[PDB]
Amino acid sequence: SKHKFKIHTYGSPTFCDHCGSLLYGLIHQGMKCDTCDMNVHKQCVINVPSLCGMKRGRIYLKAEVTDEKLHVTVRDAKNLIPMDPNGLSDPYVKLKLIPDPKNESKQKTKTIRSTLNPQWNESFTFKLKPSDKDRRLSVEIWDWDRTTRNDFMGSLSFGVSELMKMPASGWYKLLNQEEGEYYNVPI
Ligand SMILES: [Pb+2]
Ligand SMILES: [Pb+2]
Ligand SMILES: [Pb+2]
Ligand SMILES: [Pb+2]
Ligand SMILES: [Zn+2]
Ligand SMILES: [Zn+2]
């Protein structure tokens, strides 16, 4: 089901339904679909699937707590969303314990260029503090953009207190940024 996008001027802050970031500019900040009301950046049109009136792929992870250490294995991901005009992305994963208002906990994988099916095969250790029992492990995939802001691709999270009781291992469905801070969907 194809979309029919036309230029639009937005009178209140509106975000791109494809890549997540603000539609900016004095006028004509994005493209709106005549049928379903989807709003995207001009440069995102090419990557929007034909789902008018009708996902983000999946990631394979392990996360296990031993003593006071949370150890995360970031293997690979499949069927990710393209964020660049060539119909690909340059994905990396950012891991942190949230809430993190001082931005202290983040760690990241390397960037895999030009793919929707990256393999990282990297692992990360977090030394847990007592207050981390109330936090969540956040896992976010982003498209690296060299000269513009990086683009959100998909995410999920696990409760630290839950990981203490039961390690995680398997495929997980990638979620939007807001849902991903609070939920995960095993596959
Ligand atoms: Pb973009
Ligand atoms: Pb991009
Ligand atoms: Pb890119
Ligand atoms: Pb960008
Ligand atoms: Zn549409
Ligand atoms: Zn966009």
The CA 91 to ligand 3 mean position distance, Å, reads 8
Q: Please indicate the experimental technique that yielded this structure.
A: X-ray
Q: Quick one: which of 155, 131, 137, 113 has its CA closest to 62?
A: 137
Is residue 14 a contact partner of residue 40, using CB atoms and an 8 Å limit? no
171 is annotated as contributing to ligand binding? no
For residue 9, the tally of other CB atoms under 10 A from its CB is 12
Q: How far apart are CA 127 and CA 119, in angstroms?
A: 25
132 is annotated as contributing to ligand binding? no
Ligand number with the minimum distance to the CA of 112: 3
DSSP letter at 175 equals: B
134 is annotated as contributing to ligand binding? no
Q: Quick one: which of 176, 180, 165 has its CA closest to 70?
A: 165
Q: Which CATH number characterizes residue 148's domain?
A: 2.60.40.150
CA atoms lying within 13 Å on the CB side of residue 148: 9
Which residues neighbour 187 within 8 Å (Cβ) at sequence distance 6 or greater?
A: 58, 170, 171, 172, 173
Q: How far apart are CA 7 and CA 9, in angstroms?
A: 7
Ligand number with the minimum distance to the CA of 84: 2
Q: How far apart are CA 163 and CA 140, in angstroms?
A: 18
- Hey, what amino acid is at 109? T
The CA 118 to ligand 5 mean position distance, Å, reads 29
Resolution in A: 1.2
Which tokens go with 99?
Answer: 């809430």
Q: How far apart are CA 148 and CA 134, in angstroms?
A: 34
DSSP letter at 186 equals: B
Ligand number with the minimum distance to the CA of 36: 5
Which tokens go with 162?
Answer: 């839950």
Q: What DSSP element (H or E) covers 178?
A: helix 177-180
67 is annotated as contributing to ligand binding? no
Ligand number with the minimum distance to the CA of 88: 3
Which tokens go with 80?
Answer: 């990710």
The CA 156 to ligand 6 mean position distance, Å, reads 20
Count Cβ atoms within 10 A of the Cβ of residue 139 and give its class: 0-12 exposed, 13-18 middle, 19 or more buried. buried
Q: How far apart are the first and last CA of the chain?
A: 26
- The angle at the Cα of 132, spanning 130 to 136, to the nearest 5 degrees, equals 160
> Which residues surround the ion ligand 2 when the cut-off is CB under 5 Å?
83-84, 145, 151
Which tokens go with 181?
Answer: 């801070």
Q: How far apart are CA 98 and CA 174, in angstroms?
A: 17
Q: How far apart are CA 73 and CA 122, in angstroms?
A: 6
Q: How far apart are CA 172 and CA 90, in angstroms?
A: 20
Which residues are paired to 155 by β-bridges? 140, 175
Which residues are paired to 8 by β-bridges? 30
- Beta strands 39-40 and 58-66 are unpaired
The CA 47 to ligand 1 mean position distance, Å, reads 9
Phi, psi of 182 (to 5 degrees): -130, -10
Q: How far apart are CA 44 and CA 31, in angstroms?
A: 9
52 is annotated as contributing to ligand binding? yes
The CA 46 to ligand 5 mean position distance, Å, reads 13
- The angle at the Cα of 55, spanning 115 to 58, to the nearest 5 degrees, equals 60
Q: How far apart are CA 185 and CA 187, in angstroms?
A: 6
For residue 21, the tally of other CB atoms under 10 A from its CB is 15
Is residue 43 a contact partner of residue 66, using CB atoms and an 8 Å limit? no
**Which domain, by its residues, includes 89?**
58-186
Which tokens go with 10?
Answer: 């937005």
